[PDB]
Design an enzyme around this catalytic site. Structure first.
Site, short mmCIF file in Angstrom:
data_model
loop_
_atom_site.label_atom_id
_atom_site.label_comp_id
_atom_site.label_asym_id
_atom_site.label_seq_id
_atom_site.Cartn_x
_atom_site.Cartn_y
_atom_site.Cartn_z
N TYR A 96 0.80 -1.39 -0.10
CA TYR A 96 -0.03 0.09 -0.02
C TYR A 96 0.92 1.32 -0.11
O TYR A 96 0.27 2.34 -0.57
CB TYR A 96 -0.93 0.01 0.94
CG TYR A 96 -2.16 -0.80 0.68
CD1 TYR A 96 -2.09 -2.52 1.11
CD2 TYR A 96 -3.30 -0.42 -0.06
CE1 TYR A 96 -2.84 -3.15 0.78
CE2 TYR A 96 -4.39 -1.28 -0.18
CZ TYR A 96 -4.16 -2.52 0.22
OH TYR A 96 -5.11 -3.51 -0.02
N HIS A 129 -4.28 4.86 5.06
CA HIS A 129 -4.09 6.36 4.14
C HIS A 129 -4.72 6.11 2.55
O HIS A 129 -5.54 7.10 2.26
CB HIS A 129 -2.62 6.40 4.03
CG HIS A 129 -2.29 7.86 3.51
ND1 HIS A 129 -1.41 8.11 2.32
CD2 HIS A 129 -2.64 9.00 3.79
CE1 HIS A 129 -1.43 9.12 2.09
NE2 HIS A 129 -2.08 10.00 2.84
N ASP A 130 -4.29 4.96 1.88
CA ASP A 130 -5.03 5.06 0.44
C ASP A 130 -6.66 4.94 0.69
O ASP A 130 -7.38 5.35 -0.48
CB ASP A 130 -4.70 3.62 0.01
CG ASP A 130 -3.21 3.71 -0.43
OD1 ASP A 130 -2.43 4.91 -0.35
OD2 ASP A 130 -2.43 2.79 -0.53
N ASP A 138 -3.56 12.71 5.40
CA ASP A 138 -2.04 12.73 5.60
C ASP A 138 -1.39 12.81 6.89
O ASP A 138 -0.59 12.04 7.23
CB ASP A 138 -1.63 13.85 4.70
CG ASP A 138 -1.56 13.74 3.29
OD1 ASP A 138 -2.09 12.63 3.03
OD2 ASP A 138 -1.41 14.69 2.44
N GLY A 147 -1.71 3.12 -4.96
CA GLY A 147 -3.46 3.03 -4.81
C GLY A 147 -3.52 1.98 -3.75
O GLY A 147 -4.18 2.05 -2.94
N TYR A 177 -8.00 8.22 1.04
CA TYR A 177 -7.91 9.17 -0.10
C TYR A 177 -8.82 8.67 -0.96
O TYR A 177 -9.68 9.62 -1.88
CB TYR A 177 -6.45 8.88 -0.94
CG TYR A 177 -5.34 9.96 -0.69
CD1 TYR A 177 -5.37 10.60 0.57
CD2 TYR A 177 -4.14 9.54 -1.39
CE1 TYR A 177 -4.08 11.44 0.67
CE2 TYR A 177 -3.06 10.72 -1.10
CZ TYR A 177 -3.22 11.45 -0.14
OH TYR A 177 -2.01 12.18 0.19
N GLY A 183 2.81 4.17 -1.29
CA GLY A 183 3.46 4.62 -2.57
C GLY A 183 2.79 4.02 -3.69
O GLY A 183 3.06 4.09 -4.98
N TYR A 208 -3.55 21.73 0.80
CA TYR A 208 -4.41 22.21 2.18
C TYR A 208 -3.63 23.01 2.90
O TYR A 208 -2.39 23.41 2.34
CB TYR A 208 -4.67 20.93 2.77
CG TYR A 208 -3.53 19.82 3.00
CD1 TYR A 208 -2.51 19.75 3.91
CD2 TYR A 208 -3.83 18.47 2.11
CE1 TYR A 208 -1.55 19.03 3.98
CE2 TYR A 208 -2.64 17.61 2.30
CZ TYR A 208 -1.55 17.96 3.26
OH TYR A 208 -0.79 16.85 3.53
#
Length: 119
Positions: free
Chosen positions: A27, A47-48, A93, A31, A51, A29, A67
């Site tokens: 996961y 994290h993915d 993030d 999708g 997103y 680096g 952001y």
């Protein structure tokens, strides 16, 4: 945006080069697919997925969305003024950079064969 996430990692994990997290597990680096390989890869799965959820907001592109956030004295803050998209992506993030800080890094999981191990 990713440049901002790179800087967040440099904020929470200054003992590591940001690049150590750029190709890790299934996961970190990309999708992401398949089974996360350890605790740090699970940081990256969340994290993915985070997103992917932010992508449901109209006009919201997590890799590109700029952001408002701060890093200082060991602390990450997503600032007021962030719209719904910015606030979502920043939190993705921020929560990931914190997770990276507390997770073990195993060198065997850097740059693994994604086609064979992440199905």
């Amino acid at each position: 945006n990713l440049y901002q996430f790179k800087n967040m990692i440099q904020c929470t994990v200054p003992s590591r080069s940001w690049c150590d997290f750029a190709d890790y597990g299934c996961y970190c680096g990309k999708g992401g697919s398949g089974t996360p390989v350890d605790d740090l890869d699970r940081c990256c799965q969340v994290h993915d997925n985070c997103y992917n959820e932010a992508e449901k907001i109209s006009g919201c592109w997590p890799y590109f969305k700029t952001y408002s956030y701060e890093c200082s004295q060991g602390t990450l803050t997503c600032k007021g003024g962030n719209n719904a998209c910015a606030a979502a992506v920043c939190d993705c993030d921020r929560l990931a950079a914190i997770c990276f800080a507390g997770a073990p890094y195993t060198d065997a999981n850097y740059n693994i064969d994604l086609k064979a191990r992440c199905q």
